């Protein structure tokens, strides 16, 4: 992948930190060489896994655990774990050479894998490093660089996380979105004055201005080695893993990491519902109720988008533009029509086909969106979107503020069950198990290929 580039200098700095970091006395590995080797593995995983996404985090953890335990442990361990990864991959099958009372943790791993709990089996290797994965706080504080790239997918943006960090980190995060030539000139002035003033600056969505970055930002960051001699400022970049390929030298000069934090369905509902009234009310009570239902539907559709091909054949990124268009349509239909609910039948067919079904190009996914809309919008005085919540229709006095408070209360009362992806969404649990088995198979195949290479 174009984002996972690694250089010799970064590796050598990470190894230097092994000695530089006089951390807590680790496990007694006899000779100092073994302890240094273990610390090297720990530091490499702790630093260089941030620049990777979840799947490659798992792949790195498993592969480096295999590399370490193919030397520390015995053959009865090596062939056991080799056949174990063969079992996890769906390409091979068999029983490992389980030596009783000799490889205990391998027996816990066997208990994990037989119970078909793939996620815990893959997190076992991460747990065996006994190291806490660096959050962005650790990366921004420890790394002695002024440039970071915050990559992710198109479904989640970590701008709020960076805002929360920098508000708690010494001053004034300053968001500078790109776009038209006005945005470009504003950004260049802002950076030229911020390298002197020292405030942390952020560059949302670098990708759309790729041609600009190839010409202005590239040579700038490559030449401004005196920025470290300027005031202590940090320049951040937000990109997309599926986006266009950033230039290699620009990416190599800056630090990189991948933001992997998918909020829960209830968390997304709460965030959207909170943000909707921040801009102020537009119409009466029914507009508020329809906006609440639209927030629930948007959260459900975005959550189901994550699963692929389960729920949806493709990862149709439903951004906020779809929500805005659906909200505008809801306001229009509730304004032209009357207070009664009669036009629900046309609220669905427009939302399920025109605003949220426009991007869809397969009939099965269109059917999925249509049935989701039918479930969410068709309701008669009591709506059960997920098996844990019931939404009563508005009152008779039509007190809008009380209705908004009641909707907030009914959001806060409920909690998300651990099996929400099977209960809150309509797809079955066996589908989720098949999805997890597929991803575990991919991880095992990739790590076996790497180990063989």
């Amino acid at each position: 992948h174009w984002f996972y580039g690694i250089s010799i200098g970064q590796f050598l700095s990470c190894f230097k930190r092994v000695f530089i970091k006089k951390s807590r006395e680790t496990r007694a590995a006899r000779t100092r060489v073994d302890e240094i080797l273990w610390l090297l593995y720990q530091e490499v995983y702790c630093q260089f896994s941030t620049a990777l996404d979840k799947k490659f985090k798992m792949i790195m953890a498993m592969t480096m655990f295999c590399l370490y335990k193919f030397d520390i442990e015995s053959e009865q361990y090596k062939e056991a774990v080799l056949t174990m990864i063969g079992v996890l991959s769906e390409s091979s099958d068999g029983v490992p050479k389980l030596t009783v009372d000799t490889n205990n943790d391998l027996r816990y791993l066997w208990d994990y894998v037989t119970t078909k709990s793939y996620i815990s089996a893959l997190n076992w290797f991460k747990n065996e490093f006994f190291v806490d994965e660096w959050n962005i706080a650790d990366v921004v504080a420890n790394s002695e660089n002024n440039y970071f790239t915050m990559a992710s997918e198109r479904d989640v943006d970590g701008t709020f996380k960076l805002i929360e960090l920098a508000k708690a980190s010494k001053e004034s995060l300053k968001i500078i979105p790109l776009g038209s030539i006005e945005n470009l000139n504003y950004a260049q002035e802002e950076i030229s004055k911020s390298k002197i003033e020292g405030g942390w600056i952020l560059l949302q969505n670098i990708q759309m201005s790729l041609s600009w970055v190839k010409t202005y930002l590239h040579k700038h960051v490559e030449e401004t080695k005196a920025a470290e001699e300027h005031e202590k400022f940090k320049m951040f970049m937000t990109c997309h893993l599926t986006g266009d390929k950033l230039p290699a030298p620009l990416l190599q000069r800056t630090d990189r990491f991948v933001y992997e934090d998918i909020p829960g369905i209830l968390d997304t509902v709460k965030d959207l519902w909170g943000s909707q009234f921040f801009t102020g009310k537009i119409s009466g009570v029914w507009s508020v109720y329809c906006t609440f239902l639209l927030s629930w539907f948007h959260a459900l559709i975005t959550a189901r988008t994550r699963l692929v091909p389960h729920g949806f054949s493709k990862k149709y990124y439903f951004n906020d533009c779809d929500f805005q268009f659906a909200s505008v349509y809801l306001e229009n239909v509730l304004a032209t029509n009357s207070t009664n609910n009669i036009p629900w039948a046309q609220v669905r067919d427009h939302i399920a086909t025109i605003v949220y079904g426009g991007k869809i190009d397969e009939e099965k996914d269109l059917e999925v969106v249509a049935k989701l809309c039918a479930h969410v919008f068709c309701g008669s005085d009591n709506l059960q979107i997920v098996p844990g919540v019931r939404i009563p229709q508005p009152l008779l006095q039509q007190s809008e503020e009380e209705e908004r408070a009641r909707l907030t209360a009914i959001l806060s009362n409920t909690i998300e069950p651990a099996d929400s992806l099977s209960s809150w969404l309509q797809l079955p649990r066996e589908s989720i198990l098949n999805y997890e088995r597929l991803q575990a198979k991919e991880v095992a195949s990739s790590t076996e290929q790497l180990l063989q290479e």
Binding site: G179, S180, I181, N205, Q207, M208, S209, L210, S211, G243, D244, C321, Q324, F325, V328, Y329, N332, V333, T336, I342, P343, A345, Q346, D349, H350, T353, I354, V355, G358, K359, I360, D361
Partner: protein, 910 residues
């Protein structure tokens, strides 16, 4: 040029098409402007004539005319609506007003009437009224002129949309469902209590309102209204309401750009279409973008996904600038390094085609300002019913359902094949071929049956024909019969028996299918393995039609793959700026330009007699389509006359695109059109007629009688079946070796005509039989190992009669001028000695039995005027045997070309 044309004022009309997009000319008066006329041909008369003094600038009077045409269109619309409101037939008002005005008046009146009809829920009466209006328009279409016919067809399209919507509303069970359906349908309204007349009429869809700008649109190609089209309109109006642009993406040929253009026409706008990936310069596009922003027109980027990366980035930046200015509401946006006003009525649409990587999406900077939508091919049944309703078909719903069911049933039951395509395109082809058949038989079910039998049946294989017949019988209750049978069948029999061809049932069937297919189709494809009879079939049909109608025929047989694209279509000297005709365009110009020759009363045929590939046919796809024009990359755009017909003679379609197969009438030869003992007879007659010019009468009659009765198919059928048992190097089926056998036999018989007059009948019969055996052996098993040749010799001596002179491995007729007997001998084994200095010359050969036999057969094949192919391992002696056979003779001179991994065709000529 316009600036310098400020005195004549008549040179602007050339550029009116470019600067207005819809009107092609300005109709002048002696000193006034008396109107305009569009590309389709239609006089829009301005209410207020424009005076043109000599001192006035072109800019000023063009500016006044720009508003005058829109005001005239609104005046026509208002007059037509006032006329139709005071109830009057559409037939009397079609002849008065332009298509756009009558269209908008009809749409507004339909909306007004159906609103109250939906209020009262009485749809039957208005449905019947609209049906009567449609029938009146249909019968007036037959009695329409060349200009009014397009207007009537477009009004039929819109009126059938009206009737479809009214019927769907009638079938709705509940008022809620009826209003749901009414919301999606694009309704039209006008404000009776407003000023600024040009903004009176607007359009409401899904609750969103769009103003109707009264720009003249002419009489455009109206798209058939389908429930997938109105979804496209709803998506476009949803995007336009929030000021977002409009993006379509989907498979090519789904009419994305045509859907955008139809949306523009319904709103009264002409959409400026920027065509991409046509070596389209960026500066001209930037100028067009500035014009779009300043005027307020709708700009559609056709095939936007194919552009150079730098050009794509620049144009995406410009589009983002325009869209940001529209969304914010700011005026005077900054582009082209200039601040220019931005009219708020501007809009940008994009159509993205699927690339090599599969799906194509917008650049990142545009994804935040464009609402993508996925286009699909329409449902077959809906537009099938719509087209059958376009024609005067009764029970059009039932006919369309039956046709669609039959097509799906065929696709499910018939054996899979590469050219078997029963999608929507096949349906549209069936309906288009059904259209002209209405003159012969009426608009019943049997017309559809005949069109299906004339389109689908020829393209089907042998085993699937029975499926076609029985499913046609069990789906369509009535099975028709074809007319014009006796005359053309007799003419085909005459034109075939005149050329020696055998009128078997299969050959006559294929000829009849080709004749019926060419009756309507313009581009023909004939597919079948080598030797089926494609050339024989189409030549026989050409001769039959020449004898029948009396029209002359001009045939241009061109091999496409021999000639490069520059030679076939036309080459341009980019370094000197001259365009060369090429081959196809030269013979097209000789048709259009010339009139002295018999070119109006004659049928022109261009037979591409070679394998076809997508690269060659994509340069003439416009010829294949309904445009019927050859679009050269640079030069005049040639119109093909009705007589000009393109045929494709090939043997496979493993590389031809589905579009070409669907557009072109396909005739598939699943089997040989004649049996073995009909091709043999045809070749025998073709050789007898050649010998006839250099022989006496009685001798020739006796000789041909002996040749005919000497062999019979009873004995030869076993030989032909046994020849397949032999292993053949460079294998060719015996149906193609028959030519070599017959030609060699006849030539060998003719070569000894001097020694036949004084020859006894028994010895003469033995000579003829032996020579026939020799020819049969060297044609059927002539490409065998050499021991299998002896096995075939034993087979030959077995299956023929036991009394005729047996053929041995070396039996040759040697004739001496001093004796009269045939004196057949074999195995000479000559001897020769040579000096030391002659040990290596390029012409020294030691004569052995193999060398003599090979030389004799090679020379006999050469004298038969047929090409030879010597196939053997390296060093076997093919070149040596040729050069020895031709060095002895003083009639042939050898030219040795040595082919390599790539020898271009001009190497042979050089």
């Amino acid at each position: 040029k316009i600036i310098g044309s400020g005195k004549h004022h008549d040179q602007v009309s050339k550029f009116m098409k470019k600067m207005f997009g819809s009107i092609e000319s300005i109709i002048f008066l002696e000193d006034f402007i008396t109107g305009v006329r569009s590309v389709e041909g239609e006089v829009l008369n301005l209410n207020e004539k424009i005076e043109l003094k000599d001192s006035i600038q072109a800019q000023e009077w063009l500016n006044i005319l720009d508003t005058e045409i829109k005001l005239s269109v609104f005046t026509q619309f208002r007059d037509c609506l006032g006329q139709l409101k005071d109830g009057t037939d559409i037939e009397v008002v079609v002849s008065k007003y332009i298509f756009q005005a009558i269209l908008l008046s009809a749409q507004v009146m339909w909306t007004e009437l159906v609103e109250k009809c939906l209020q009262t829920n009485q749809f039957s009466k208005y449905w019947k009224e609209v049906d009567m209006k449609i029938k009146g328009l249909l019968d007036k279409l037959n009695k329409s002129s060349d200009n009014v016919k397009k207007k009537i067809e477009a009004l039929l399209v819109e009126y059938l949309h009206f009737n479809n919507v009214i019927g769907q509303l009638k079938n709705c069970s509940t008022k809620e469902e009826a209003r749901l359906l009414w919301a999606k349908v694009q309704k039209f309204y006008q404000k009776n209590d407003t000023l600024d007349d040009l903004n009176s009429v607007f359009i409401s869809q899904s609750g969103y309102l769009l103003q109707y700008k009264f720009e003249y649109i002419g009489i455009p190609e109206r798209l058939i209204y389908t429930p997938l089209l109105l979804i496209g309109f709803a998506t476009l109006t949803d995007s336009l309401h929030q000021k977002y642009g409009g993006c379509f993406f989907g498979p090519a040929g789904t009419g994305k750009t045509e859907t955008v253009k139809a949306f523009g026409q319904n709103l009264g706008r002409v959409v400026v279409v920027f065509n991409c990936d046509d070596s389209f310069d960026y500066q001209v596009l930037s100028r067009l973008l500035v014009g779009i922003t300043q005027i307020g027109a709708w700009g559609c980027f056709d095939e936007f996904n194919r552009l150079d990366e730098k050009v794509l980035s620049a144009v995406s930046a410009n589009i983002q600038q325009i869209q940001n200015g529209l969304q914010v509401g700011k005026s005077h946006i900054t582009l082209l390094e200039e601040e220019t006003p931005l009219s708020p009525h501007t809009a940008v649409f994009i159509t993205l085609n699927p690339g090599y990587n599969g799906r194509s999406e917008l650049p990142e900077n545009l994804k935040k300002s464009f609402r993508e939508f996925s286009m699909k091919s329409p449902q077959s049944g809906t537009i099938a019913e719509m087209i059958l309703q376009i024609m005067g078909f009764e029970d059009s719903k039932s006919l369309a359902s039956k046709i669609v069911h039959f097509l799906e049933l065929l696709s499910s039951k018939c054996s899979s094949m590469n050219h078997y395509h029963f999608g929507l395109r096949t349906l549209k082809g069936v309906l288009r071929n059904c259209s002209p058949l209405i003159s012969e038989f009426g608009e019943g079910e049997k017309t559809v049956v005949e069109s299906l039998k004339r389109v689908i049946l020829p393209s089907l294989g042998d085993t699937d024909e029975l499926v076609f017949k029985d499913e046609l019988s069990k789906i369509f209750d009535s099975a028709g019969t074809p007319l014009n049978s006796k005359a053309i069948v007799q003419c085909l029999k005459d034109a075939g028996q005149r050329s020696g061809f055998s009128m078997s049932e299969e050959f006559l069937k294929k000829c009849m299918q080709f004749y019926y297919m060419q009756k309507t189709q313009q581009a023909l494809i004939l597919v079948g393995k080598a030797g089926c009879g494609k050339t024989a079939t189409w030549k026989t049909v050409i001769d039959a039609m020449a004898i029948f109608d009396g029209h002359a025929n001009v045939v241009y047989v061109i091999d496409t793959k021999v000639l490069t694209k520059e030679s076939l279509y036309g080459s341009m000297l980019k370094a000197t700026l001259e365009w060369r005709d090429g081959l196809f365009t030269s013979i097209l110009r000789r048709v259009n330009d010339d009139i002295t020759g018999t070119f109006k009363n004659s049928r022109i045929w261009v037979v591409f007699d070679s394998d076809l590939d997508p690269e060659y046919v994509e340069a003439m796809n416009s010829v294949l389509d309904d445009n019927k024009i050859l679009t050269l990359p640079n030069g005049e755009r040639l119109p093909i006359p009705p007589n000009f017909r393109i045929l494709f003679e090939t043997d496979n379609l493993d590389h031809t695109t589905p579009a070409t197969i669907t557009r072109c009438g396909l005739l598939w030869f699943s089997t040989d059109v004649c049996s073995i003992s009909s091709k043999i007879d045809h070749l025998l007659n073709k050789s007898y007629e050649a010998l006839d010019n250099k022989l006496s009468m009685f001798e020739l009659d006796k000789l041909k009688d002996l040749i005919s009765d000497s062999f019979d198919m009873a004995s030869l059928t076993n030989i032909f079946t046994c020849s397949n048992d032999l292993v053949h190097i460079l294998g060719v089926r015996t149906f193609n070796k028959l030519e070599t056998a017959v030609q060699l036999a006849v030539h060998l018989i003719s070569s000894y005509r001097q020694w036949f007059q004084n020859l006894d009948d028994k010895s003469l019969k033995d000579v003829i039989t032996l020579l026939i055996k020799r020819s049969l052996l060297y044609a059927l098993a002539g490409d065998s190992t050499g021991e299998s040749q002896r096995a075939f010799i034993q087979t030959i001596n077995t299956y023929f009669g036991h009394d005729s002179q047996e053929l041995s491995d070396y039996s040759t007729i040697v004739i001496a001028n001093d004796k009269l007997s045939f004196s057949s001998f074999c195995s000479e084994i000559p001897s020769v000695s040579l000096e030391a200095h002659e040990v290596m010359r390029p012409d020294i050969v030691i004569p052995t039995i193999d060398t003599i036999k090979h030389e004799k057969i090679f020379y006999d094949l050469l004298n038969s005027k047929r090409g030879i192919i010597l196939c053997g391992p390296p060093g076997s002696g093919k070149t040596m045997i040729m050069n020895n056979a031709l060095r002895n003779s003083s009639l042939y001179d050898v030219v040795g070309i040595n082919f390599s991994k790539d020898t271009t065709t001009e190497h042979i000529l050089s």
